[PDB]
Structure 1
Amino acid sequence: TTQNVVLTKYGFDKDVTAIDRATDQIWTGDGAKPLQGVDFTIYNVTANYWASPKDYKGSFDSAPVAATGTTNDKGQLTQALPIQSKDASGKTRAAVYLFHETNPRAGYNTSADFWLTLPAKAAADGNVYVYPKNVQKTTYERTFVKKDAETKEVLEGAGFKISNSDGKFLKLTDKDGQSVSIGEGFIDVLANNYRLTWVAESDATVFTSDKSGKFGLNGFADNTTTYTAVATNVPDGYDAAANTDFKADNSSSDILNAPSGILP
Protein backbone atom coordinates (compact mmCIF):
# COMPACT_ATOMS: atom_id res chain seq x y z
CA THR A 1 0.00 0.00 0.00
CA THR A 2 1.30 3.32 -1.18
CA GLN A 3 0.43 6.97 -1.11
CA ASN A 4 1.04 9.34 -4.04
CA VAL A 5 3.17 12.29 -3.06
CA VAL A 6 2.85 15.19 -5.57
CA LEU A 7 5.70 17.69 -5.22
CA THR A 8 5.05 21.11 -6.85
CA LYS A 9 7.80 23.65 -7.23
CA TYR A 10 6.74 27.30 -7.56
CA GLY A 11 8.92 30.45 -8.06
CA PHE A 12 7.79 33.79 -6.80
CA ASP A 13 9.19 37.25 -7.15
CA LYS A 14 12.21 37.96 -4.96
CA ASP A 15 10.42 39.66 -2.05
CA VAL A 16 7.33 37.44 -1.95
CA THR A 17 7.36 34.53 0.46
CA ALA A 18 4.41 32.12 -0.01
CA ILE A 19 2.37 30.95 3.04
CA ASP A 20 2.90 27.25 3.77
CA ARG A 21 0.24 24.89 2.45
CA ALA A 22 -0.81 21.62 4.20
CA THR A 23 -0.54 18.27 2.48
CA ASP A 24 -4.31 18.11 1.90
CA GLN A 25 -4.49 21.37 -0.09
CA ILE A 26 -4.28 21.62 -3.83
CA TRP A 27 -2.67 24.89 -4.60
CA THR A 28 -2.27 26.37 -8.07
CA GLY A 29 0.50 28.80 -7.03
CA ASP A 30 -1.57 31.90 -7.96
CA GLY A 31 1.04 34.53 -8.49
CA ALA A 32 4.00 32.14 -9.24
CA LYS A 33 5.81 30.35 -12.02
CA PRO A 34 6.17 26.52 -12.02
CA LEU A 35 9.87 25.54 -12.00
CA GLN A 36 10.84 22.89 -14.49
CA GLY A 37 13.94 20.69 -14.34
CA VAL A 38 14.51 20.70 -10.54
CA ASP A 39 16.05 17.42 -9.45
CA PHE A 40 15.06 15.69 -6.15
CA THR A 41 16.13 12.48 -4.41
CA ILE A 42 13.66 10.93 -1.93
CA TYR A 43 15.47 9.02 0.83
CA ASN A 44 13.88 6.24 2.87
CA VAL A 45 14.86 7.44 6.31
CA THR A 46 12.55 4.96 8.17
CA ALA A 47 15.53 3.19 9.72
CA ASN A 48 17.35 6.43 10.66
CA TYR A 49 14.21 7.88 12.25
CA TRP A 50 13.17 4.71 14.13
CA ALA A 51 16.67 4.10 15.54
CA SER A 52 15.71 7.08 17.86
CA PRO A 53 12.68 9.27 16.89
CA LYS A 54 13.22 12.00 19.42
CA ASP A 55 16.83 12.47 18.14
CA TYR A 56 15.94 12.59 14.43
CA LYS A 57 17.05 15.84 12.74
CA GLY A 58 16.96 14.93 9.03
CA SER A 59 19.98 12.67 8.59
CA PHE A 60 19.89 10.60 5.42
CA ASP A 61 23.32 9.04 6.05
CA SER A 62 23.12 5.38 4.86
CA ALA A 63 19.46 5.76 3.91
CA PRO A 64 18.32 3.92 0.75
CA VAL A 65 17.11 5.99 -2.17
CA ALA A 66 13.34 5.51 -2.43
CA ALA A 67 13.15 7.47 -5.73
CA THR A 68 14.60 10.24 -7.84
CA GLY A 69 12.70 12.71 -9.98
CA THR A 70 12.76 15.90 -11.94
CA THR A 71 10.02 18.51 -12.06
CA ASN A 72 8.09 18.73 -15.34
CA ASP A 73 6.53 21.74 -17.16
CA LYS A 74 3.97 22.14 -14.41
CA GLY A 75 6.68 22.22 -11.79
CA GLN A 76 5.64 18.72 -10.67
CA LEU A 77 6.88 15.35 -9.81
CA THR A 78 4.76 12.51 -8.51
CA GLN A 79 5.94 9.39 -6.67
CA ALA A 80 4.07 6.50 -5.08
CA LEU A 81 5.75 5.67 -1.75
CA PRO A 82 5.09 2.59 0.53
CA ILE A 83 3.24 3.78 3.64
CA GLN A 84 5.08 1.17 5.77
CA SER A 85 8.76 0.22 5.68
CA LYS A 86 11.21 -1.66 7.90
CA ASP A 87 13.49 -0.21 10.54
CA ALA A 88 17.12 -1.35 10.91
CA SER A 89 16.24 -4.49 12.84
CA GLY A 90 13.60 -5.53 10.28
CA LYS A 91 10.50 -4.52 12.22
CA THR A 92 7.76 -2.91 10.13
CA ARG A 93 6.96 0.70 10.97
CA ALA A 94 5.30 3.78 9.62
CA ALA A 95 7.56 4.90 6.73
CA VAL A 96 9.51 8.14 6.86
CA TYR A 97 10.79 9.89 3.69
CA LEU A 98 13.22 12.78 3.29
CA PHE A 99 13.10 15.06 0.19
CA HIS A 100 16.48 16.45 -0.80
CA GLU A 101 16.91 18.85 -3.76
CA THR A 102 20.04 17.97 -5.70
CA ASN A 103 19.86 20.45 -8.63
CA PRO A 104 18.00 23.75 -8.36
CA ARG A 105 16.79 25.74 -11.36
CA ALA A 106 19.15 28.40 -12.64
CA GLY A 107 18.36 31.67 -10.88
CA TYR A 108 16.98 29.92 -7.73
CA ASN A 109 18.34 28.88 -4.35
CA THR A 110 17.88 25.32 -3.27
CA SER A 111 15.01 24.39 -0.90
CA ALA A 112 15.64 23.06 2.57
CA ASP A 113 15.46 19.27 3.22
CA PHE A 114 12.08 18.15 4.62
CA TRP A 115 10.61 14.85 5.80
CA LEU A 116 7.27 13.30 6.64
CA THR A 117 5.70 10.17 8.00
CA LEU A 118 3.17 8.18 6.01
CA PRO A 119 0.30 7.83 5.81
CA ALA A 120 -0.03 11.62 5.58
CA LYS A 121 -3.15 13.74 5.35
CA ALA A 122 -4.33 13.57 1.77
CA ALA A 123 -6.40 15.97 -0.35
CA ALA A 124 -9.85 14.94 -1.68
CA ASP A 125 -8.19 13.16 -4.64
CA GLY A 126 -6.04 10.90 -2.35
CA ASN A 127 -2.74 12.62 -3.14
CA VAL A 128 -0.36 14.16 -0.61
CA TYR A 129 0.78 17.63 -1.81
CA VAL A 130 4.14 19.13 -0.80
CA TYR A 131 5.34 22.57 -1.95
CA PRO A 132 9.03 23.16 -1.26
CA LYS A 133 10.15 26.77 -1.24
CA ASN A 134 12.64 27.92 -3.86
CA VAL A 135 13.67 31.49 -3.31
CA GLN A 136 14.67 33.43 -6.47
CA LYS A 137 18.17 34.84 -6.46
CA THR A 138 19.31 37.90 -8.25
CA THR A 139 21.45 37.20 -11.29
CA TYR A 140 23.01 39.51 -13.84
CA GLU A 141 23.34 39.83 -17.60
CA ARG A 142 25.35 41.51 -20.30
CA THR A 143 24.64 42.42 -23.89
CA PHE A 144 27.03 43.59 -26.62
CA VAL A 145 26.23 45.04 -30.05
CA LYS A 146 28.82 44.46 -32.75
CA LYS A 147 29.14 47.38 -35.15
CA ASP A 148 31.14 48.53 -38.15
CA ALA A 149 33.31 51.36 -36.77
CA GLU A 150 33.00 53.39 -39.95
CA THR A 151 29.34 53.03 -40.90
CA LYS A 152 28.11 52.39 -37.33
CA GLU A 153 25.72 49.78 -38.71
CA VAL A 154 25.25 46.50 -36.82
CA LEU A 155 27.50 43.62 -37.92
CA GLU A 156 26.34 39.97 -37.97
CA GLY A 157 28.49 36.89 -37.63
CA ALA A 158 31.28 38.14 -35.35
CA GLY A 159 32.49 35.46 -32.87
CA PHE A 160 33.72 35.99 -29.31
CA LYS A 161 34.81 33.99 -26.22
CA ILE A 162 34.61 35.28 -22.68
CA SER A 163 37.52 34.98 -20.25
CA ASN A 164 37.92 35.55 -16.48
CA SER A 165 40.86 36.88 -14.42
CA ASP A 166 42.37 33.34 -14.13
CA GLY A 167 42.65 33.08 -17.94
CA LYS A 168 39.85 30.50 -18.11
CA PHE A 169 37.01 30.77 -20.65
CA LEU A 170 33.25 30.44 -20.41
CA LYS A 171 31.54 27.24 -21.53
CA LEU A 172 27.82 26.88 -21.18
CA THR A 173 26.41 23.46 -20.24
CA ASP A 174 22.99 22.01 -19.63
CA LYS A 175 21.71 21.33 -16.05
CA ASP A 176 23.66 18.04 -16.00
CA GLY A 177 27.02 19.51 -17.14
CA GLN A 178 26.70 18.22 -20.77
CA SER A 179 27.73 20.27 -23.81
CA VAL A 180 25.08 22.30 -25.59
CA SER A 181 25.05 23.83 -29.08
CA ILE A 182 24.91 27.58 -28.65
CA GLY A 183 23.78 29.69 -31.62
CA GLU A 184 23.95 33.37 -32.38
CA GLY A 185 22.64 36.24 -30.29
CA PHE A 186 21.75 36.69 -26.62
CA ILE A 187 21.71 33.37 -24.75
CA ASP A 188 18.92 33.06 -22.21
CA VAL A 189 20.71 30.87 -19.60
CA LEU A 190 17.80 31.30 -17.18
CA ALA A 191 15.06 30.23 -19.66
CA ASN A 192 17.08 27.17 -20.79
CA ASN A 193 18.34 26.22 -17.31
CA TYR A 194 21.98 26.30 -18.47
CA ARG A 195 25.13 26.55 -16.33
CA LEU A 196 28.22 28.77 -16.60
CA THR A 197 31.53 26.84 -16.34
CA TRP A 198 35.14 27.94 -16.77
CA VAL A 199 37.45 25.88 -19.01
CA ALA A 200 40.47 25.97 -21.34
CA GLU A 201 40.23 28.43 -24.25
CA SER A 202 39.87 25.67 -26.85
CA ASP A 203 36.79 24.15 -25.09
CA ALA A 204 34.99 27.48 -24.62
CA THR A 205 31.60 28.51 -25.97
CA VAL A 206 31.70 30.89 -28.98
CA PHE A 207 29.12 33.66 -28.82
CA THR A 208 28.19 35.25 -32.18
CA SER A 209 26.61 38.55 -33.10
CA ASP A 210 23.17 37.99 -34.63
CA LYS A 211 21.40 39.92 -37.45
CA SER A 212 20.99 42.92 -35.08
CA GLY A 213 24.62 42.73 -33.95
CA LYS A 214 23.63 41.40 -30.55
CA PHE A 215 25.19 38.79 -28.38
CA GLY A 216 25.55 38.11 -24.67
CA LEU A 217 23.88 36.13 -21.89
CA ASN A 218 22.14 36.20 -18.54
CA GLY A 219 22.64 34.08 -15.44
CA PHE A 220 25.92 35.58 -14.15
CA ALA A 221 26.26 35.24 -10.37
CA ASP A 222 27.50 38.80 -9.59
CA ASN A 223 28.06 42.32 -10.98
CA THR A 224 31.52 42.83 -9.42
CA THR A 225 33.70 40.29 -11.29
CA THR A 226 35.55 41.55 -14.44
CA TYR A 227 35.39 39.39 -17.58
CA THR A 228 36.81 40.02 -21.06
CA ALA A 229 35.12 39.58 -24.45
CA VAL A 230 37.82 38.34 -26.88
CA ALA A 231 37.20 38.30 -30.66
CA THR A 232 37.76 34.83 -32.21
CA ASN A 233 35.92 34.99 -35.53
CA VAL A 234 36.27 38.26 -37.44
CA PRO A 235 34.02 39.04 -40.42
CA ASP A 236 36.06 39.16 -43.70
CA GLY A 237 37.16 42.73 -44.49
CA TYR A 238 37.42 43.81 -40.84
CA ASP A 239 40.22 44.02 -38.27
CA ALA A 240 39.63 42.12 -35.01
CA ALA A 241 37.94 44.16 -32.31
CA ALA A 242 40.11 45.07 -29.31
CA ASN A 243 39.45 43.02 -26.17
CA THR A 244 36.56 44.38 -24.13
CA ASP A 245 36.62 44.28 -20.33
CA PHE A 246 33.17 44.21 -18.70
CA LYS A 247 31.08 43.36 -15.67
CA ALA A 248 27.75 41.66 -15.70
CA ASP A 249 25.92 44.84 -14.83
CA ASN A 250 22.79 44.41 -17.00
CA SER A 251 24.07 47.01 -19.53
CA SER A 252 24.38 46.93 -23.35
CA SER A 253 27.50 48.43 -24.94
CA ASP A 254 28.94 48.51 -28.48
CA ILE A 255 32.00 46.62 -29.76
CA LEU A 256 33.50 48.25 -32.90
CA ASN A 257 35.12 46.48 -35.88
CA ALA A 258 37.28 48.74 -38.13
CA PRO A 259 37.11 47.92 -41.83
CA SER A 260 40.58 46.75 -42.89
CA GLY A 261 42.35 49.50 -44.88
CA ILE A 262 43.58 48.91 -48.43
CA LEU A 263 46.37 51.31 -49.39
CA PRO A 264 47.18 52.11 -53.10
Structure 2
Amino acid sequence: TTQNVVLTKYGFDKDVTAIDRATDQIWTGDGAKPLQGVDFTIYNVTANYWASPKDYKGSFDSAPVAATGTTNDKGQLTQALPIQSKDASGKTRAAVYLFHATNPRAGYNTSADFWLTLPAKAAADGNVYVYPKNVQKTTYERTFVKKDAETKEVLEGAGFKISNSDGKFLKLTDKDGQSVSIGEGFIDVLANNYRLTWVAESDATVFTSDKSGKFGLNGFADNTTTYTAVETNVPDGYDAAANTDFKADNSSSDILDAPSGILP
Protein backbone atom coordinates (compact mmCIF):
# COMPACT_ATOMS: atom_id res chain seq x y z
CA THR A 1 0.00 0.00 0.00
CA THR A 2 1.32 3.37 -1.15
CA GLN A 3 0.59 7.08 -1.25
CA ASN A 4 1.20 9.38 -4.18
CA VAL A 5 3.53 12.20 -3.31
CA VAL A 6 3.40 15.15 -5.66
CA LEU A 7 6.45 17.41 -5.44
CA THR A 8 6.13 20.88 -6.97
CA LYS A 9 9.13 23.21 -7.30
CA TYR A 10 8.42 26.93 -7.62
CA GLY A 11 10.98 29.68 -8.20
CA PHE A 12 10.74 32.85 -6.16
CA ASP A 13 12.24 36.31 -6.29
CA LYS A 14 15.43 36.46 -4.18
CA ASP A 15 13.80 38.48 -1.33
CA VAL A 16 10.46 36.62 -1.12
CA THR A 17 10.12 33.77 1.37
CA ALA A 18 7.36 31.09 1.14
CA ILE A 19 5.22 30.10 4.12
CA ASP A 20 4.96 26.40 5.05
CA ARG A 21 2.01 24.55 3.53
CA ALA A 22 0.35 21.36 4.72
CA THR A 23 0.51 18.26 2.56
CA ASP A 24 -3.26 18.39 1.92
CA GLN A 25 -3.05 21.80 0.23
CA ILE A 26 -2.90 22.17 -3.53
CA TRP A 27 -0.97 25.40 -4.10
CA THR A 28 -0.62 27.08 -7.48
CA GLY A 29 2.45 29.16 -6.55
CA ASP A 30 0.64 32.56 -6.80
CA GLY A 31 2.04 32.62 -9.58
CA ALA A 32 5.74 31.97 -9.03
CA LYS A 33 7.53 30.20 -11.88
CA PRO A 34 7.40 26.40 -11.93
CA LEU A 35 10.94 25.02 -12.19
CA GLN A 36 11.42 22.33 -14.80
CA GLY A 37 14.29 19.86 -15.01
CA VAL A 38 15.15 19.73 -11.30
CA ASP A 39 16.48 16.37 -10.08
CA PHE A 40 15.49 14.81 -6.78
CA THR A 41 16.49 11.65 -4.99
CA ILE A 42 14.04 10.28 -2.46
CA TYR A 43 15.76 8.29 0.28
CA ASN A 44 14.05 5.76 2.48
CA VAL A 45 15.22 6.93 5.91
CA THR A 46 12.84 4.69 7.89
CA ALA A 47 15.76 2.91 9.57
CA ASN A 48 17.71 6.12 10.29
CA TYR A 49 14.67 7.75 11.89
CA TRP A 50 13.44 4.79 13.94
CA ALA A 51 16.95 4.15 15.28
CA SER A 52 16.06 7.15 17.53
CA PRO A 53 13.14 9.44 16.45
CA LYS A 54 13.81 12.23 18.95
CA ASP A 55 17.41 12.50 17.65
CA TYR A 56 16.67 12.39 13.90
CA LYS A 57 18.03 15.45 12.11
CA GLY A 58 17.86 14.48 8.43
CA SER A 59 20.68 11.96 7.99
CA PHE A 60 20.39 9.65 4.97
CA ASP A 61 23.57 7.77 5.72
CA SER A 62 23.26 4.18 4.45
CA ALA A 63 19.68 4.93 3.39
CA PRO A 64 18.50 3.14 0.26
CA VAL A 65 17.14 5.11 -2.69
CA ALA A 66 13.35 4.89 -2.82
CA ALA A 67 13.14 6.78 -6.14
CA THR A 68 14.64 9.42 -8.40
CA GLY A 69 12.95 11.92 -10.67
CA THR A 70 12.96 15.21 -12.50
CA THR A 71 10.43 18.02 -12.37
CA ASN A 72 8.41 18.53 -15.56
CA ASP A 73 7.04 21.68 -17.28
CA LYS A 74 4.63 22.25 -14.33
CA GLY A 75 7.53 21.95 -11.85
CA GLN A 76 6.09 18.61 -10.81
CA LEU A 77 7.34 15.18 -9.95
CA THR A 78 5.03 12.37 -8.83
CA GLN A 79 6.00 9.18 -7.02
CA ALA A 80 4.00 6.47 -5.25
CA LEU A 81 5.74 5.48 -2.00
CA PRO A 82 5.05 2.57 0.40
CA ILE A 83 3.44 3.93 3.57
CA GLN A 84 5.21 1.24 5.65
CA SER A 85 8.79 0.01 5.68
CA LYS A 86 11.29 -1.85 7.88
CA ASP A 87 13.63 -0.41 10.51
CA ALA A 88 17.21 -1.64 10.99
CA SER A 89 16.09 -4.61 13.14
CA GLY A 90 13.52 -5.81 10.56
CA LYS A 91 10.55 -4.42 12.42
CA THR A 92 7.74 -2.84 10.35
CA ARG A 93 7.27 0.91 10.85
CA ALA A 94 5.54 3.92 9.39
CA ALA A 95 7.79 4.85 6.47
CA VAL A 96 9.97 7.96 6.50
CA TYR A 97 11.24 9.54 3.28
CA LEU A 98 13.83 12.24 2.79
CA PHE A 99 13.78 14.43 -0.34
CA HIS A 100 17.17 15.50 -1.65
CA ALA A 101 17.72 17.87 -4.60
CA THR A 102 20.71 16.58 -6.56
CA ASN A 103 20.63 19.02 -9.53
CA PRO A 104 19.02 22.45 -9.15
CA ARG A 105 17.70 24.63 -11.97
CA ALA A 106 20.30 27.04 -13.38
CA GLY A 107 20.26 30.31 -11.42
CA TYR A 108 19.01 28.63 -8.21
CA ASN A 109 20.58 27.29 -5.05
CA THR A 110 19.86 23.73 -4.07
CA SER A 111 16.67 23.18 -2.02
CA ALA A 112 16.80 22.34 1.69
CA ASP A 113 16.45 18.62 2.53
CA PHE A 114 13.09 17.77 4.05
CA TRP A 115 11.45 14.57 5.20
CA LEU A 116 8.09 13.23 6.24
CA THR A 117 6.30 10.19 7.66
CA LEU A 118 3.66 8.23 5.78
CA PRO A 119 0.78 7.97 5.72
CA ALA A 120 0.53 11.75 5.53
CA LYS A 121 -2.45 14.08 5.39
CA ALA A 122 -3.65 14.05 1.76
CA ALA A 123 -5.59 16.49 -0.41
CA ALA A 124 -9.12 15.86 -1.74
CA ASP A 125 -7.63 13.96 -4.72
CA GLY A 126 -5.76 11.52 -2.42
CA ASN A 127 -2.32 13.01 -3.12
CA VAL A 128 0.30 14.29 -0.70
CA TYR A 129 1.70 17.67 -1.81
CA VAL A 130 5.20 18.88 -1.00
CA TYR A 131 6.90 22.13 -2.01
CA PRO A 132 10.70 22.28 -1.60
CA LYS A 133 12.13 25.69 -0.66
CA ASN A 134 15.23 27.28 -2.12
CA VAL A 135 16.79 30.65 -2.88
CA GLN A 136 17.29 32.10 -6.34
CA LYS A 137 20.87 33.20 -6.79
CA THR A 138 22.09 36.39 -8.42
CA THR A 139 23.76 35.56 -11.75
CA TYR A 140 25.29 37.83 -14.37
CA GLU A 141 25.36 38.26 -18.12
CA ARG A 142 27.41 39.83 -20.89
CA THR A 143 26.50 41.01 -24.38
CA PHE A 144 28.74 41.99 -27.31
CA VAL A 145 27.95 43.71 -30.62
CA LYS A 146 30.29 42.88 -33.50
CA LYS A 147 30.92 45.76 -35.89
CA ASP A 148 32.81 46.80 -38.96
CA ALA A 149 35.47 49.24 -37.65
CA GLU A 150 35.23 51.43 -40.76
CA THR A 151 31.45 51.60 -41.33
CA LYS A 152 30.37 51.07 -37.69
CA GLU A 153 27.64 48.78 -39.01
CA VAL A 154 26.93 45.46 -37.34
CA LEU A 155 28.60 42.28 -38.51
CA GLU A 156 26.80 38.92 -38.71
CA GLY A 157 28.53 35.53 -38.49
CA ALA A 158 31.66 36.35 -36.46
CA GLY A 159 32.63 33.38 -34.24
CA PHE A 160 34.13 33.69 -30.73
CA LYS A 161 35.38 31.50 -27.91
CA ILE A 162 35.68 32.57 -24.28
CA SER A 163 38.58 31.76 -21.97
CA ASN A 164 39.40 32.31 -18.29
CA SER A 165 42.73 33.16 -16.59
CA ASP A 166 43.65 29.44 -16.49
CA GLY A 167 43.63 29.31 -20.31
CA LYS A 168 40.59 27.04 -20.28
CA PHE A 169 37.65 27.74 -22.57
CA LEU A 170 33.91 27.89 -22.08
CA LYS A 171 31.71 24.99 -23.17
CA LEU A 172 27.98 24.97 -22.62
CA THR A 173 26.37 21.67 -21.69
CA ASP A 174 22.87 20.57 -20.78
CA LYS A 175 21.87 19.91 -17.13
CA ASP A 176 23.43 16.40 -17.40
CA GLY A 177 26.81 17.53 -18.85
CA GLN A 178 26.05 16.53 -22.48
CA SER A 179 26.95 18.60 -25.52
CA VAL A 180 24.40 20.99 -27.01
CA SER A 181 24.40 22.74 -30.38
CA ILE A 182 24.67 26.49 -29.89
CA GLY A 183 23.57 28.89 -32.63
CA GLU A 184 23.93 32.61 -33.18
CA GLY A 185 23.09 35.49 -30.85
CA PHE A 186 22.66 35.83 -27.11
CA ILE A 187 22.40 32.44 -25.40
CA ASP A 188 19.83 32.24 -22.61
CA VAL A 189 21.47 29.64 -20.36
CA LEU A 190 18.96 30.34 -17.60
CA ALA A 191 15.90 29.71 -19.78
CA ASN A 192 17.50 26.60 -21.30
CA ASN A 193 18.96 25.22 -18.07
CA TYR A 194 22.47 24.95 -19.48
CA ARG A 195 25.75 24.73 -17.59
CA LEU A 196 29.02 26.60 -18.01
CA THR A 197 32.03 24.26 -18.06
CA TRP A 198 35.72 25.00 -18.69
CA VAL A 199 37.52 22.79 -21.18
CA ALA A 200 40.26 22.58 -23.83
CA GLU A 201 40.14 25.17 -26.64
CA SER A 202 39.29 22.51 -29.25
CA ASP A 203 36.13 21.45 -27.34
CA ALA A 204 34.93 24.98 -26.55
CA THR A 205 31.59 26.46 -27.57
CA VAL A 206 31.73 28.92 -30.46
CA PHE A 207 29.46 31.96 -30.04
CA THR A 208 28.38 33.76 -33.20
CA SER A 209 27.19 37.32 -33.83
CA ASP A 210 23.63 37.28 -35.14
CA LYS A 211 22.06 39.59 -37.75
CA SER A 212 22.20 42.52 -35.34
CA GLY A 213 25.83 41.76 -34.43
CA LYS A 214 24.75 40.51 -31.00
CA PHE A 215 26.15 37.59 -29.05
CA GLY A 216 26.80 36.58 -25.46
CA LEU A 217 25.09 34.77 -22.60
CA ASN A 218 23.69 34.87 -19.07
CA GLY A 219 24.34 32.54 -16.13
CA PHE A 220 27.79 33.71 -15.05
CA ALA A 221 28.48 33.02 -11.38
CA ASP A 222 30.09 36.40 -10.54
CA ASN A 223 30.89 39.88 -11.86
CA THR A 224 34.48 40.04 -10.54
CA THR A 225 36.19 37.39 -12.70
CA THR A 226 37.94 38.49 -15.88
CA TYR A 227 37.31 36.49 -19.05
CA THR A 228 38.61 36.96 -22.59
CA ALA A 229 36.64 36.93 -25.83
CA VAL A 230 38.80 35.52 -28.63
CA GLU A 231 37.66 35.73 -32.26
CA THR A 232 38.11 32.31 -33.87
CA ASN A 233 36.01 32.64 -36.99
CA VAL A 234 36.52 35.93 -38.79
CA PRO A 235 34.09 37.02 -41.52
CA ASP A 236 35.77 36.99 -44.92
CA GLY A 237 37.30 40.34 -45.85
CA TYR A 238 38.03 41.34 -42.25
CA ASP A 239 40.95 41.19 -39.86
CA ALA A 240 40.42 39.64 -36.44
CA ALA A 241 39.58 41.98 -33.57
CA ALA A 242 42.07 42.08 -30.72
CA ASN A 243 41.15 39.86 -27.79
CA THR A 244 38.62 41.51 -25.49
CA ASP A 245 38.85 41.21 -21.71
CA PHE A 246 35.56 41.51 -19.84
CA LYS A 247 33.66 40.94 -16.63
CA ALA A 248 30.15 39.53 -16.62
CA ASP A 249 28.77 42.87 -15.45
CA ASN A 250 25.39 42.86 -17.25
CA SER A 251 26.74 45.30 -19.86
CA SER A 252 26.91 45.45 -23.66
CA SER A 253 29.99 46.67 -25.58
CA ASP A 254 31.24 46.67 -29.16
CA ILE A 255 33.94 44.57 -30.74
CA LEU A 256 35.41 46.08 -33.89
CA ASP A 257 36.63 44.18 -36.96
CA ALA A 258 38.78 46.16 -39.41
CA PRO A 259 38.24 45.43 -43.10
CA SER A 260 41.34 43.83 -44.63
CA GLY A 261 43.26 46.27 -46.82
CA ILE A 262 43.87 45.38 -50.47
CA LEU A 263 46.86 47.08 -52.10
CA PRO A 264 47.69 47.43 -55.80
Asked whether the two chains share a fold, i.e. TM above 0.5, the reply is: yes
Name 2:192's counterpart in structure 1.
192
Displacement of 1:134 in angstroms is 2.2
Query: CA offsets, 1:161-209, max 9 Å, x none?
Result: 0000111100000000111111111000000000001111111100001
Tell me the distance in 2 between the aligned counterparts of 1:123 and 1:164. 51
Displaced runs of 4 or more, over 2 A: none
Moved more, 185-194 or 44-53: 44-53
Percent of residue pairs identical: 99
Tell me the distance in 1 between the aligned counterparts of 2:71 and 2:173. 19
Displacement of 1:106 in angstroms is 0.2
Name 1:136's counterpart in structure 2.
136
Displacement of 1:31 in angstroms is 3.0
Query: CA offsets, 1:184-243, max 9 Å, x none?
Result: 110000000000011111111000011111100000001010000000000010000100
Tell me the distance in 2 between the aligned counterparts of 1:116 and 1:98. 7
Moved more, 211-220 or 52-61: 52-61
Gaps of 5+ in 2: none
Tell me the distance in 2 between the aligned counterparts of 1:54 and 1:13. 35
Name 2:261's counterpart in structure 1.
261
> How many pairs does the alignment contain?
264
Query: CA offsets, 1:14-46, max 9 Å, x none?
Result: 111111111111100013000000000000001
The answer to whether the 8 A contact 1:12-1:31 is kept is no
TM (normalized to structure 1)? 0.99
Query: CA offsets, 1:43-77, max 9 Å, x none?
Result: 00011111121221111111110000100000000
Tell me the distance in 2 between the aligned counterparts of 1:238 and 1:252. 22
Tell me the distance in 1 between the aligned counterparts of 2:48 and 2:13. 37
Displacement of 1:89 in angstroms is 1.5
Moved more, 9-18 or 246-255: 9-18
TM (normalized to structure 2)? 0.99
The answer to whether the 8 A contact 1:7-1:77 is kept is yes
Gaps of 5+ in 1: none
Over the residues paired in the alignment, what is the CA RMSD in angstroms?
A: 0.7
Matches within 5 A, 1:1-264: 1-264=1-264
Secondary structure of 1:133's counterpart equals coil
The answer to whether the 8 A contact 1:58-1:113 is kept is yes
Moved more, 72-81 or 9-18: 9-18
